[PDB]
Design a binder for this molecule. Structure first.
Ligand SMILES: Cn1nc(C(N)=O)c2ccccc21
Ligand SMILES: [Zn+2]
Length: 140
């Protein structure tokens, strides 16, 4: 579980989005597992714009922030989980590290701020959904 609070926008895993998220929707994408909803207050998190392939993510199923090297945002295949079956997901960066399904929402961060959130993985791999290619999050 976890969200990005960038201004009056809550960024969540689409598969973990609440009735309130859909009742106050902005943008969503099934192939990216990303949903942005509206908020009644500006947030405490800033977004990264960069091509960094290193940072740190929160792994809830360890209560640890792990340093990680991670791929650039691109197309990958995922295996069956509690939410989705074995499918492909886009704009998804991968790294070596522990992730279960419940680790989704945990933030990934580089020097430039928030890179994205846990969304995918398996077999000592963790997959992050990129929010760096969503520049509109900073404004409006
Ligand atoms: C981080 N993570 N997200 C999923 C998913 N949404 O299917 C997954 C599945 C297996 C292992 C790790 C995983
Ligand atoms: Zn950075």
């Amino acid at each position: 579980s976890g969200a990005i609070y960038v201004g009056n926008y809550r960024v969540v895993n689409r598969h973990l989005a609440t009735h309130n998220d859909w009742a106050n929707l902005v943008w969503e994408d099934s192939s990216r597992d990303l949903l942005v909803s509206s908020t009644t207050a500006q947030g405490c998190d800033t977004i990264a714009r960069c091509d960094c392939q290193t940072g740190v993510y929160y792994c809830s199923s360890r209560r640890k922030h792990y340093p990680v090297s991670f791929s650039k945002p691109s197309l990958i295949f995922v295996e069956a989980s509690e939410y989705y079956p074995a499918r492909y997901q886009s704009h998804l960066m991968l790294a070596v590290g522990h992730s279960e399904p419940g680790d989704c929402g945990g933030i990934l961060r580089c020097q430039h701020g928030v890179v994205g959130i846990v969304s995918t993985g398996g077999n000592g791999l963790v997959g992050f959904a990129d929010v760096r290619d969503l520049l509109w999050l900073d404004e409006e």
